[PDB]
């Protein structure tokens, strides 16, 4: 699980740039992920948590600003590996709200 | 009167209710002890996905039931 | 396009398809490279099952898009 392949192939909709404080804080959280979060994180935003032939920066990964602050979850679809993130008013919440939504969240 | 909300984690939701409770306000109880807007939650009690508009009598649940909650999140 | 299946057993199957293939065909050429019948074939795309009568884009698996195997008895 190579999560600097994927950063290194990562696009950004609806707004965020790689420049964008809530991206920064959010690699911030994903690189310092447990490989147990950094599974989840990737069942959920992909579908499964087995890397791809070629490595995590096959994924493509896109994530798009899913509007302004609140306190509603990330959600994703992962026939894209979109992953939907409100902006968030801080780094701990942007935290606390993706690591909930990859832990309680399984299904279509 | 209590009801449990079981997570995917494990973890336990412990609910104060009223039977006469819609499930509108049980969603919200959540929403307060979790931060979940009610719409991406789905609430499950026997097999049947709990529907707004009727209360927690309309489907016999009693104190100390368990419910599972389930969040509409990845919908891929 | 290409396109790679890993197995349980980590081996990977490269399979060459085109876009507009049905998922009987991909287990069908699977069947072909490696000689597991399709009925024990179980193809995961994006954590979804596929399903034998949709075709490869219906899952947007595009090129060199990795599917799962896993043997379905």
Not at chain 1, 60 to 83: Q, W, Y
């Amino acid at each position: 699980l190579d999560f600097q392949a994927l950063e290194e192939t990562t696009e950004y909709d609806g707004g965020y740039t790689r420049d964008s404080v809530l991206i920064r804080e959010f690699w911030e959280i994903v690189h310092s992920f447990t490989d147990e979060q950094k599974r989840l994180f990737l069942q959920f935003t992909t579908g499964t948590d087995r890397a791809p032939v070629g490595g995590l920066g096959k994924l493509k990964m896109i994530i798009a600003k899913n509007g302004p602050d609140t306190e509603r979850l990330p959600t994703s679809h992962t026939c894209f590996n979109v992953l939907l993130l409100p902006e968030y008013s801080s780094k701990e919440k942007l935290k606390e709200r993706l690591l909930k939504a990859i832990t309680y969240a399984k299904g279509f | 009167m209590q009801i449990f909300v079981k997570t995917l984690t494990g973890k336990t939701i412990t609910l104060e209710v009223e039977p006469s409770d819609t499930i509108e306000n049980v969603k919200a109880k959540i929403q307060d002890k979790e931060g979940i807007p009610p719409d991406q939650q789905r609430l499950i009690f026997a097999g049947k996905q709990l529907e707004d508009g009727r209360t927690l009598s309309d489907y016999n649940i009693q104190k100390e039931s368990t419910l599972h909650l389930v969040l509409r999140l990845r919908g891929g």
